[PDB]
């Protein structure tokens, strides 16, 4: 049944290198869903962060339709290995490092619906650059993003659109694997840009990170007040015993330096 | 089974000289599949009691493409989770007190996927924190007391004690 349906699709003249055709000759519309699994290693020095996500792409390829109306055949067919399908050559413009997960078996999912609609899911671990602004350092908020666009296909061939309902989703155990920050807000936008090789469609998901204060309260502010207050207890020593006063003022001052370093 | 580890951040198959796999095909069609895998899994930890805390780390296992209609995972009936003898001896900082074998089947936007979850319970060894934190801090606080026995006239001695122990206390905490 399923293996037969796959046979019927590739027994004909199908080329996985050819962009899927369109009714009005328009571009291929690729709907994108994104599931953030974990957001970790938020490096402030190299201004970047790590994040593992499940990318989900969906486009129509009338060449792969097998059931059309169906209603007698399976709604969709899981694409087995050895069958090539044109896929959006999407990449992450601000990715500095990336890994697909292929343990035991590649972590991918491809479905070919009867109407030709294709679902593509894959696990990806990224290390994206996130320019950070530390004007308010201790109590700051940063906005990090994941950009997603086609590399070779221009605006006439491929166009990205965020899924209509809940384009960005977060796994439940995300905020619990992110101890140092608090993911306050997320947004889903477009970043289509005009380059020297053409105009390329682009999506941009954005997360807002609020730095946890408890640490800086206990490791910076509290101990500094405690340090400044100690410098005051020398105002109560007789003016004759200056060795005691100096020892206090100097020590607290030196310590203040170390803490800052 | 195209199984993967949902909470794996890094993974390696061992293929030195020869891939580290074992496949058997029993006469009745039953298939055994064995493979060595090194993982780096995420384990959210809660340090409320830090020095004397216990953490629970897990390994999730599920199919990626196949839903509940095609593939279903079940823990072996007898001893689903086993530990090699030389495990606790390669884990000096903690003590593996308890293990559990559970299910984590979840309903996602692409369907309902079967999932297994093995869980280990890690108890943090105390001897280190006794010797490197508590003992030396009591010893530090006790030193701040020996200045109560110096004549009230020699305050330089008292300050030198109180201030030093205080500064040192800071460093230790850092």
């Amino acid at each position, epitope marked *: 049944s399923d293996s037969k349906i796959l046979a019927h699709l590739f027994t004909s003249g199908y080329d996985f290198r050819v962009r899927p055709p369109t009714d009005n000759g328009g571009p291929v519309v690729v709907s994108v869903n994104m599931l953030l699994r974990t957001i970790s290693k938020i490096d402030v020095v190299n201004m970047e962060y790590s994040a593992q996500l499940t990318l989900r792409e969906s486009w129509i390829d009338k060449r792969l339709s097998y059931g059309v109306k169906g209603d007698g055949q399976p709604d969709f067919v899981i694409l087995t290995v050895g069958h090539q399908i044109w896929m959006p050559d999407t990449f992450f413009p601000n990715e500095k490092q990336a890994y697909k997960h292929t343990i035991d078996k590649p972590n991918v999912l491809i479905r070919i619906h009867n109407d030709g609609t294709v679902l593509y899911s894959v696990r990806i671990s990224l290390v994206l650059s996130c320019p950070m602004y530390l004007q308010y350092y201790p109590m700051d908020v940063q906005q990090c993003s994941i950009d997603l666009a086609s590399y070779a296909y221009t605006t006439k061939d491929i166009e990205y659109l965020w899924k209509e309902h809940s384009p960005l989703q977060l796994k439940v155990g995300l905020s619990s694997s992110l101890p140092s920050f608090q993911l306050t807000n997320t947004s889903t936008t477009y970043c289509t840009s005009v380059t020297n090789t053409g105009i390329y469609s682009c999506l941009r998901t954005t997360i807002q990170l609020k730095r946890e204060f408890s640490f800086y309260l206990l490791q910076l502010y509290i101990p500094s007040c405690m340090l400044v207050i100690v410098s005051w207890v020398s105002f109560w020593f007789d003016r004759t015993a200056i060795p005691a006063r100096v020892t206090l003022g100097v020590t607290t001052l030196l310590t203040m330096t170390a803490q800052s370093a | 089974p195209d199984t993967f580890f949902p909470n794996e951040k890094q993974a390696y198959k061992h293929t030195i000289d020869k891939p580290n796999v074992l496949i058997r095909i029993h006469n009745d069609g039953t298939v055994l599949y064995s493979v060595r895998i090194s993982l780096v899994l995420s384990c959210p930890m809660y340090l409320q009691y830090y020095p004397m805390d216990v953490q629970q780390c897990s390994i999730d296992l599920a199919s990626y493409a196949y839903t509940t209609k095609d593939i279903e995972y*079940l823990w072996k009936e007898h001893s689903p989770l086993q530990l090699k003898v030389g495990l606790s001896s390669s884990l000096p900082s903690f003590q593996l007190t308890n293990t559990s074998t559970t299910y984590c*089947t979840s*309903v996602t*936007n692409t369907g309902i996927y079967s999932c297994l979850r093995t869980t280990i319970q890690l108890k943090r060894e105390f001897s280190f924190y006794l010797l490197q934190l508590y003992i030396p801090s009591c010893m530090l606080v006790i030193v701040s007391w020996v200045s109560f026995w110096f004549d009230r006239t020699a305050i330089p001695a008292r300050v030198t004690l109180g201030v030093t122990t205080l500064l040192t206390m800071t460093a230790q905490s850092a």
Partner: antibody
Amino acid sequence: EVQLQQSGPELVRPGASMKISCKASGYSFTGYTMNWVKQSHGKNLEWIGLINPYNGGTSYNQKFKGKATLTVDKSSSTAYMELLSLTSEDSAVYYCARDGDYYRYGRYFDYWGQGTTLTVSS
Amino acid sequence: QAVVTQESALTTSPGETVTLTCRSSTGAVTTINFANWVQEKPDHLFTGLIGGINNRAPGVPARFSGSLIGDKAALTITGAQTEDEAIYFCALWYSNHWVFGGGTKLTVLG
């Protein structure tokens, strides 16, 4: 104590479509996925489908594919169910039954609602 | 398609041990059927008893217990009580959906 209070009884004409609710209280609403069961006078208990509040994810019984539409409103801790192209056959009592496990599918039933009686007659 | 079968009704006295059974038409009830048991008191009061792997609902009395006696799912009430008199529906999980049985009307003779 947890509670699942559903909307009151409804009378609607064939061809129309109405939506019954299921307001959950007494537990972290977004943690347990919701089932929808249909009890008719003509047949047994039928399982319509289920939805994960936290996820928005849904899975329907092939029989009710298109007849029912499960949604969820996190803010109000309410689970909704649309029923389209209502007919005589849709005249039944619709229950909502919570799944058992915390932030995972356990495939066992916890608490149900008092039920919502839907009467479709022209 | 697949049909779940139960005893039309059963009888038992307070204190005794009664057992309801849930039969699969496609074959034996296996662990991937996740046999569920649901109770319906008069006036349309539903509540879960057993289900999943070997999980039970919050508050389900210890007298209730599930098993796979023979090749069908069982629901054994050890030490039946007066309030135990109700209708018990069992549901089997076939691949991607639930199928309920006809239900069993357990009567506790008072």
